[PDB]
Paper text:
To ascertain whether structural divergence drives HPV type specificity, we scrutinized the crystal structures of L1 pentamers of genetically close or distant HPV types. First, L1 proteins of HPV33 and HPV52 were cloned and expressed in E.coli, purified, digested by trypsin, and crystalized. The crystal structures of HPV33 and HPV52 pentamers were determined to resolutions of 2.9Å and 2.75Å, respectively, with refinement to Rwork/Rfree values of 21.0/24.0% and 18.7/23.5%, respectively. Both structures show a hollow lumen in the central axis, and two neighboring monomers intertwined by surface loops. It should be noted that the surface loops in the non-crystallographic symmetry (NCS)-related monomers within the asymmetric unit of HPV33, HPV52, and HPV58 might differ slightly in conformation due to their intrinsic flexibilities. Collectively, the structural information suggests high conservation of the overall structures of L1 within a phylogenetic group of HPV, which even extends across different groups, despite minor variations in the outer antigenic surface loops.
HPVs are non-enveloped, double-stranded DNA viruses comprising multiple copies of the major (L1) and minor (L2) capsid proteins. The native T = 7 HPV virion can be mimicked by an empty icosahedral shell, called a virus-like particle (VLP) which consists of 72 L1-only pentamers.
Numbering used by the authors:
A (entry chain A): 20 to 54, 61 to 178, 184 to 408, 442 to 476
B (entry chain C): 19 to 408, 442 to 478
C (entry chain D): 20 to 55, 60 to 178, 183 to 408, 443 to 475
D (entry chain E): 15 to 55, 60 to 408, 443 to 481
The structure:
C-alpha cells in the first residue's frame, strides 16, 4: 500500500551544501519579560528548539543546465543526505527554582513527630534538572506527548488524566524530572514545581507514535541521551487527597505524638549529574543512509524540521549592575539579573532527486499529501505553530569544499 | 522418555507475520488502590495501584493458525499436519520519559541514624516512627515464553514439630515458588519476601510493599525445567547501593551474645545495649538511555531450552520490570480560590502512568502428526492435541490480556518492527 | 622435575554433566544462635562468608559405564578432569549492612573536630556500615589457602603492641572474607572486641594467598580464579583508648593552654569502608566458565575424585528484617514487637567433566607416588576431616545425556 | 659500526641469544607504622615507617653472567665477547587485600569550612588547629630501568645577592631533581614539594608527609635522556577529586588587592576580610580490581629509549607505587582485664603491611668487543668495561633483592616461566 520512496524517487549525483551560519538567542531562563509584548523572551536550556528550514524549490531553482530532467513528465525534490548540528558556548548546567516552593519536611533521614502545616510553609528552593540531549529530523514537525486534564465525567477532587498528542513548537519545555504534564492545569497552587515550568506544559517526544506513522515524514532518525537521579526526598504541604488506607499500618495511639499521620505526598528532586564532552550528540556529522520509515529523507514541500534538546549548555549567566557607586558594599546598591544564551549552527548536505510523474505515481503522491502535487503545478496549516524559521533559499552552493560539512562529505560520505 | 528440541518435530515455513498491540496505557496510584471506601462496596476499584515497581505480565493471544484465513493453504496438509506460531522477533516499546519515583511510609519504624553519631541514651519509648521516603533499587528485566514466568520469595514457614511457639518468636522462613502475575511487586532493596506475614507491624518497609509480596524471578528453576516453556530468553539489569544506615525500634529478638563485646559499666550510659537491628535504605542511582533494555528489537535465534520459540496454545507471555520510568506525577487541585495562599485550600494527589507498545514477528510452522510425535506431544501437554481436534488452569491468575486475533498482517514492511525484520534476515 | 598433566594424562571424548540442584542455607548474618545448651538453631549465614564446596565425584574406575572398552584396566586407570563450570546464584542483588552497638568510634574527624573535650570512661556508639564488595571463585582439587595477620611470638609489658606474623591456613566454609579492615585475627589483635563490627570482631578474616597457590609446584589448589573487589572510604573516625604510639615531637609545634590544645587528640584514625553499587554487568556468576588451560601443571585433573569450589559473593548480601507481634492491640507500641535479622544464600553448581585415562608405566607410577602416594593406593594397583566444608555429593548425579541440562546445552554450542 | 659521536640503540651492538632464565624473589614482606618510625628514644629504629603512600624502589642484583656456571659455554667466545642480561618480562606480585588507608594530623591547620556556610564573623585566636584525617590521591605506577629513577619536587630556592629578605616572607621556589629512593613519599594531593622546608608550621598537611618530601617522577626528563637507562618503560594510573574546602589560620601573606572586591563598612562584620588561603582535601575514590597494574605479566618488546632492556652492571631497578592496598590495621592491646569496659584499659596502635613477589625472565646477550664498541661503551659508562676485565649509589636507600643464587633455566617450574613459554610460543626444554 505505502511504499519506500526508493521505488518512485530517482536519485541524481548532484549534491548541494547549505549552512545557516551563526544562530543566537538570548533571554531570561525562567520567564519572558512582558512590558502583551515581549522585551526579553524566555530562553532556557530546558526548551525544545524546533527549526523550520526553508529550501529553494528545485523546480524553480536557477539551475544552469535544465537538460537532466523533463518538466513535461518529471518534477524535482530535495533529499537530505547529511546534517551537522553545531553548538557553541561551553558545557555547563543551569538551575531552576521557586521562591515559594511547596516543600514541607525533608523525609530522607529525620522527620519526627510532629509539626503540622499551618498556613504557609513554602520555602525558597532550587535544583538542577534531568539532563536530556535529543535531535529529531523530518520533513513534518515532530509530535510529543504529555498528561492533561480530562473530561469531568468535588472542589479539590483529583483531576482525571488523559494522554495528549500535540506538535512540539519552538520554546516548548522538555520534561525535567517531574514528568511530561500540563502543570498549568494539573497543579493549581503554582508552587509544586519551579517557576520555569509551573505554568508551562512539559512535553516528551511520542517516539512510538511517530515511528508507526505509515509514511514516516516526522521521523527520519533520532538520537537521544537522558539521565537523572533522585537528589532529595521531600513531602508536600496541603491536605492529602488520598489518605493512606488503614490496612497498611497500625495507627498511632491517641494522646500520642503519632495519632495524626503526616502527609505521604512525597516528591523527589531530580539531578542530571555530570555533563561531559564524550556524551555529546552534536558538533559531529550525521549521514542519513537509510531512514527508519518509508520516507527515505525526501524533503516534501521543500522544507525540513530539525528538533533539538540540549541541556548540556544550560549555564545561566549572573549579571550584576550598580545602582549607586559607593566606597563600601551595600546590598541595596546592586541589582541581580539572569540571562541565558543558546548558539547553533545548522549545516546540511542535500541530494537532487527527480520524480517521473506516471499515472500510478501521481495517484500515490495525491493520497500521501495532495499539497505536493498542487505546489508542483502539474493558507499554510502550520502557521498557527511556533518555529525558529531558517531561510536557506539563497544559501545553496554547489562547491562543497568551501564549507566545513562539505569537506567532510568529500571524505567521509 | 527424553525431551528433545522442538526442531526435531516442528518444520519452519518461510511465512512470516507481524502483530502489534498499539499503545497500552494504565494510570493509577503508585502506593495503593483506591476502592470507593465510603459510598459503596470494597471491591469497586476507582483507581488501581499502578507503580513502576510492579511486574507487567502480558498474556498475548494469537489467532489459531489452523483456523486462520490464509490466502494459500497449499503449504501444509490438514490431513496429516497442524500449524503453530513461532516467535522470531520482539520489540518492547516504552513511552513516557525516563525518571525515578519515590516511595515511603508516614510511620516507618526508623529509630536512630547509625551512620556517624549514635551516642548512648537509647531507650525508644512507645512510638518513635517517622515519616520517611526513599528511592528503590533499579531493575530492568524482560522474560519471554509461552507459559507464565515463575518467581521466588521468602514466606512464613511452618514451625518445627513438637516445638513451641511463644508469641513473638522469630518466624520460620520458607522459599516459595509461584507464578508471577501482573501487578506483583519486584524486589526493592529489602529482598524478595512476603511482607504481609513476615513483618507484622506493617511499618518496617514503605506502604507500597508492606502488605505485598515482593518476588524475584527463579531464573535457575525456569532454566532447568525440561521443556523450557517459561524461558525462551531473558534480559535483566539490576543495580543498587546503600544510602542510609538505620536501626529499628521494638525489642531486639536475638540479643548480641556476650562473647562478642565487653559490656558497659552500670551507673554509666552504656549499661543497656542499643538495638543492633540495623537496616539500610536502598538507592537505584542514575537512570540512563544507554542502559535501556527496551525500545530496541530482540531476535530469537536459539532459545535456551528445548522449546525454540514455539507458542503452544497460541499464546505467549511477556514479562517486564522497568523502574527507569517510575516518575510519580504530583497533582494538586484547588478547594477555594483566594487572593492569598493557604495550605488548607489545596489537596495533593499522586498518579503514575505506564505506556507500552508490544511488537512481534511470528513464523508459521507445521507439525507432521506421526505416531511417535503425537505420543511425545501427549506426554508434554495433552491439551495441545485436544485443541487441534486430531477449564483453563491460568484463569485464576491476573494478566494484562493482549488480544491479537484481529491484529496479524503479512505485509511486514508496513510496520516498524517488520521493516527492521526485512533488513536483519535479508529477506 | 614437575611436569604438566598433559604429558601423562590422556583425554577421551566422553563428557558428563553434574548438577547439585538447589542449595539453600538461612541464618543470622552476625552470629550463631544457641538453644533453649550447646546447639546451633540458626547458623551464622552471611554474604561476607567464604562458601567452600567440597564436591565428591564418582570413582570412574568403579563407575557403571555403558561402554568400558575405551581403556585397559590392567595397565590404565581413570580420573575426571573439569572442563566446565557454572556457579548459579539465586536471590536478588542487594547489599547488607553490619554494625556494632558498642563500636569504638570517638570523633568524626572529617570536617570539624575542635579541641574541646577529654575522652572519658566509655564513649562507644551504635554504628553500622556497608562492607567492601568482593566477588571471587577459586577452583582446584585441593582446598584453597588463605592469608591473614595473627599474633606472633613475644620475643614484654601488658599494653604493648602485639607482634605481627603473616599466617597461612586452609580456607574453610563459613570463614569470613576481608571487609575493609584487613585480613587479621580480630579475636587476638583487637582486645576490646569493639574496634570492628560484631560479625568479624571475634573472627579471623582471610584473604586468598594467590601468590603462594600459584607458586606451589603441582598447582592442585588453583586451576583458575576470578576476582572483583572494590571499596571506598565513607567516613573518617578516630579511636578512644590510650594512643599506644604517641606522635613524635619532630612532627609538630606543640599547643598552648590558651588554645586548649596542649594535649593532642588521638591520631588513631580509622576509616569506614563502602562497597558502592552492585550491578548486573559486574557479575561473575550465572554464566559458564570453561577451563581450557589451567595456570599450573595440574590442568584440571580431579585427583581423589573430588573438586573444591570456593566462592565469595557479597552482591546478594541483603539481610531481611523480620518482625513478629507479641501482643495484638489496636494501637502501636514498640513493646509489642520483636525485631530479627535473617539472611539466605542460594546456589546451584553445574559442572561438565571429561573422562581421562592414565597409562601406569614404571616412570608414571614413580612420578605419581612422589606427588601423592594415596592416589595409587586408592586405585588398588584423610587429613581434611578436621576442616569444615559444604559437602556436595555428585556420586549419583552424573549424566551422559548432556542436552537435558542447562550447562550441557551451553556446552554443546561452545 | 657504532659511531662514538652519536648514541644508538643497543640493538646495534648487543647480540641476543635464545638463552632465557627465570628469577624470582619469593615473598617480600615489610610491616611498620603508616605515619612515622618508632625509634629507641640516640637514633635506633625499632619499628620502621611502612605506608602505601611510599615509593618502593627495588635494586635487583643479578649474577654476573661472565662468571656464571653455564653447563655449555659454546654459544659465545670468551676471547672476543662479553655477556650481559637483558630483561624480557616482569610480573610484580602483590599480596594483601585491596583497601584504602587514611592519614591525618591531630593539629591540622584548618580554620573554617569554606564550602557552604562561612558567615562573618569569626575571631582567629591563638590556636584553632583541629584533629582531622583524609584519604589521599590514588596512585599506581611501575618503572623499570638499569639505573634508579629520577623524581621532581619543589624545594626552597637560593636567595642570591639579596639578604634584605624579611622573616616570614614567601620562600623562593625551585624545581629539584633527585634519585627516588625506597621509602620516599609519593605526592598525595598537596603537590610534590619539600614540606619540611616550605611549610614551617608543620601543621598544614598530615603528619605522614609534613616533614617529608613528596616526589613525582620526572617522566619527561627520564624519557629525553640519551642512553635511556632509567626508563625502559612505565605504567601509571592516578586519580583524585576534591572532598572538602577549607582555609588556613595564620596571617595571609599575599592579601587580596583592593581592585578585586568592594570593601565592607568599618562598623560592619566585613571590614576585616577572612583568609582566602584556601586548601582542599583530596580523595582517591574507589579502588577496583579492574584497574590493577600489578599481578599481571608485562613483556618488554621494545623500550622507548636506546637501552632496550640491557641490565648494564648486572643490576635492575623496579620502582612501584601502589596506594590500592593501603589499609592500615587497627591493633588493640589490653592493659587491665576487667569485667566492664573502660577506655583507659586499652591501647590503640596502627600497623601497615606490604606484600610483594617480584618475578623476572632474563635473556642472555653477547657483545663482540671490537674497537668501535669498546670506545662506545667507554664513553657511555667506563665501569662496564672495567668490570668485564677486558658503587656511588650506596648513599641511597633501596630495597635490595639478591637474585645471584636464584636464576634457573627450568622455565616451566615457575609461575612467570609458564606464562613466558606460552607468550613466546616455546615448549619446555
Amino acid at each position: 500500500k505505502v511504499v519506500s520512496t526508493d521505488e518512485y524517487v530517482s536519485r541524481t549525483s548532484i549534491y548541494y551544501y547549505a549552512g545557516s551560519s551563526r544562530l543566537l538567542t538570548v533571554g531570561h531562563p525562567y520567564f519572558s519579560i512582558k512590558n502583551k509584548k515581549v522585551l526579553v523572551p524566555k530562553v532556557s536550556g530546558l526548551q525544545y528548539r524546533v527549526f523550520r528550514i526553508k529550501l529553494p524549490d528545485p523546480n524553480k531553482f536557477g539551475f544552469p543546465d535544465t537538460s537532466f530532467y523533463n518538466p513535461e513528465t518529471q518534477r524535482l525534490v530535495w533529499a537530505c543526505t547529511g546534517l551537522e548540528i553545531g553548538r557553541g558556548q561551553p558545557l555547563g548546567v543551569g538551575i531552576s527554582g521557586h521562591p515559594l516552593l511547596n516543600k514541607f519536611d525533608d523525609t530522607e533521614t529525620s522527620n519526627k513527630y510532629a509539626g503540622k502545616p499551618g498556613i504557609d510553609n513554602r520555602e525558597c528552593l532550587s535544583m538542577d534538572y534531568k539532563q536530556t540531549q535529543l535531535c529529531i529530523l523530518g520533513c513534518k514537525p515532530p509530535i510529543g506527548e504529555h498528561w492533561g486534564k480530562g473530561t469531568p465525567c468535588n472542589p479539590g477532587d483529583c483531576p482525571p488524566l488523559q494522554l495528549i498528542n500535540s506538535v512540539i513548537q519552538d520554546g516548548d519545555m522538555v520534561d525535567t524530572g517531574f514528568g511530561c504534564m500540563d502543570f498549568n492545569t494539573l497543579q493549581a497552587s503554582k508552587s509544586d514545581v519551579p517557576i520555569d515550568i509551573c505554568s508551562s506544559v512539559c512535553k516528551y517526544p511520542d517516539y512510538l507514535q511517530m515511528a508507526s506513522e505509515p509514511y514516516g515524514d516526522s521521523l527520519f532518525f533520532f538520537l537521544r541521551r537522558e539521565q537523572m537521579f533522585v537528589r532529595h526526598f521531600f513531602n508536600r504541604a496541603g491536605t492529602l487527597g488520598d489518605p493512606v488506607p488503614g490496612d497498611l499500618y497500625i495507627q498511632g495511639s491517641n494522646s500520642g505524638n503519632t495519632a495524626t499521620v503526616q502527609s505521604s505526598a512525597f516528591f523527589p528532586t531530580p539531578s542530571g549529574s555530570m555533563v561531559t564532552s564524550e556524551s555529546q550528540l552534536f558538533n559531529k556529522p550525521y549521514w542519513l543512509q537509510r531512514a527508519q520509515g518509508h520516507n527515505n529523507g525526501i524533503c516534501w514541500g521543500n522544507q525540513l524540521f530539525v528538533t533539538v534538546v540540549d541541556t548540556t549548555r544550560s549555564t545561566n549567566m549572573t549579571l550584576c549592575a550598580e545602582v549607586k557607586k559607593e566606597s563600601t558594599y551595600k546590598n541595596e546598591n546592586f541589582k541581580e539579573y539572569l540571562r541565558h544564551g543558546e548558539e547553533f549552527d545548522l549545516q546540511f548536505i542535500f541530494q537532487l532527486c527527480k520524480i517521473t510523474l506516471t499515472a500510478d505515481v501521481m495517484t500515490y503522491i495525491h493520497k500521501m499529501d495532495a499539497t505536493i502535487l498542487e505546489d508542483w503545478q502539474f493558507e499554510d496549516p502550520l502557521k498557527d505553530y511556533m518555529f525558529w524559521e531558517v531561510d536557506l533559499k539563497e544559501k545553496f552552493s554547489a562547491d562543497l569544499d568551501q564549507f566545513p560539512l562539505g569537506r567532510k562529505f568529500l571524505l567521509q560520505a
